[PDB]
C-alpha cells in the first residue's frame, strides 16, 4: 500500500494539476494594457500644446489637429483618441486577455501649482476643451480597465485633478 | 518520501516567498524622488536670469519673482524653493517609498569656465544671492536623499561647484 | 567606466545591509557583488556560503557571472580576482546549480 | 525532478544575469559626450561673425577675441577651441563611458546659398580662417566619436560642407 503512498503522490499531483494558477490572464492583461497606456502619451503635447497655445484643452486630436482615435495604432491599440485634452486609448480585440479585450481609460491633466497634472486612468472626458475638470465618461467601464488588470498607479477616474 | 522531495519543493518554495526582493521601495523611490527633480529645472532660468540681469542669484524663488516653496508642485512634490539662486523641492508624504517621504535636494550653479554649473543633489543653499558658492543646509538630512535612493548623478553636495 | 569598488562606492546597501533568509551579508567588490548563506535552518553543508556577481566587458556591455566568491582587481578593471575565502563561502558547484558555476577568472 | 524545472528555473537564470545589457555605456556616451555638444554652440556666434564682419573665419577663439580651447568648460568639457571658424570640445577623461573619455568633435560652417551650414561632426578644421572649406585634422580619432557612440545626425566630417 505504498501503492496509496504512491497514489497518494499520484493523488497530491491529482488535484496539483488543476486551479493552482492565479491571476495571469490578469497579469499579462496589465501590460497588455499597459502597452496600449504606451501610445497616446505623446499626444499630451500638442494637447497642452493647444491648451498651451490658447488656454483650452484640445477638445480632441482633431481641435489639437493630431493623430485621430483610429489614428495612431498598433499591437492592443485598436483606438487613440482625444477628449477636451483627455486622451484615451483602447485595448485590442483579440491576442489579449480575453476580459481587457478591446478597455480604453482616459488622460486627463487638470493645472496645477506646476502646469497641469495629467492622470493614467479611466477612460473620462473633460467637462470642456476649455475646462481641467473632467467626466467620467465611463462607457459602462468595458473599456475602463479593472485596477486589479491594471497596475496600482494607473487608477485615475475623471476627479483625478 | 517523495513526499519530503515534495515537502523539499514545498521547503525550498516555503524560504522562496520570503525576503527574495531587495530595494525595490528603494528604487520607485529614485524615481517617485527624480519625479520631484522634473520641476523645480525650469525655475533654473531666472535664477539664472537673475544671475544673468545682475550678476547674483535670486535669494529665492521671490527675488528671482518665481513661483515660490508651496508654489509649482504636484505629484511627489510638496515644496519648490530657490535658496540664492540655489533651487530644491520636496517629496510628498504619501503613496512614496516610505523612506524618502517628504525628502528634498538642492540645485546650485557656480560659475564656470563656461557660465555656471548647476547640480542636482543634496538640500544645500548658496551663501549668498550675490555669491556662487552655497551652504550645505542638510535639515537633519530628512529632506536630502539617499544616494543610493538617488541615482548614481543626482548625488550633490553643496561643495559641488 | 569603473566599477564601484563596493556598495558604498556605489553608495548603495553594504554588506549587512540588504538581506533576510538564508542571506547574512550582501557585498560587491570592485562592481563583483556577492551574498552568503545564513548559518542555520540551512543545509548544514552550505551553511554560511558565498558566490560572487562579476561583469567583464562584452561586444555587448558587459557579462556578469553567477558564480564563486571573487572580487575584481580594480574598481576601474574589470577582470577579478578568485578571493576563494577558503571556499567556505565558496559554494559545492554540486551544491549549486549547472550553470551558477562561475570563477573570477569568468569574463 | 522539479528540482531539474528549478534548477532549470535557475539554470535560465544562471544565464541570464549576464551579458544581457547592450551599448548602454555606448548610450550614455552619446548624451556624455552631447553634454559636450551643447556648450561651443555660443562661439558659432562670434565666429560667424568674424566671418560675417570679415568674410573669414577666425582662425580660433582669439581671432573671434573668444573664449579659447581651456576656455569655457565644465562637466564633460575639458576643452572647446575653434579653428578657422571651426569649434571643437573635448569630452572629460572620467566619470564618463570609458569609451568616449576625453573626445572631440568639429564644428564647420561653409557657405550656403544662405549664409553657411555649420556641423555637428568629427574633430576637423578649418583650411584657412579665410576659408570655409575644412580638413579633417582627425587626431588619430581618440577625440573623434564614434558616429555608433554619436547620434544619428552629428556624424560630420570635414568634407561636411
Chains 1, 2, 4 share one sequence.
Not at 108 to 126: D, E, H, L
Amino acid at each position: 500500500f505504498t501503492l496509496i503512498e504512491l497514489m497518494i503522490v499520484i493523488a497530491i499531483v491529482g488535484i496539483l494539476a488543476a486551479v493552482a494558477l492565479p491571476a495571469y490572464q490578469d497579469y499579462t492583461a496589465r501590460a497588455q494594457v499597459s502597452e496600449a497606456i504606451l501610445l497616446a502619451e505623446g499626444q499630451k503635447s500638442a494637447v497642452t500644446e493647444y491648451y498651451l497655445n490658447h488656454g483650452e484643452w484640445p477638445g480632441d486630436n482633431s481641435s489639437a489637429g493630431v493623430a485621430t482615435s483610429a489614428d495612431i495604432k498598433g499591437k492592443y491599440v485598436q483606438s487613440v483618441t482625444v477628449a477636451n485634452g483627455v486622451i484615451t486609448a483602447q485595448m485590442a480585440s483579440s491576442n489579449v486577455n480575453n476580459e481587457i479585450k478591446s478597455k480604453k481609460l482616459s488622460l486627463w491633466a487638470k493645472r496645477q501649482n506646476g502646469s497641469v497634472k495629467w492622470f493614467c486612468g479611466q477612460p473620462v472626458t473633460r467637462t470642456t476643451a476649455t475646462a481641467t475638470d473632467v467626466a467620467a465618461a465611463n462607457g459602462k467601464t468595458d473599456d475602463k480597465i479593472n485596477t486589479k488588470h491594471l497596475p496600482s498607479t494607473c487608477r485615475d477616474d475623471s476627479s483625478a485633478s
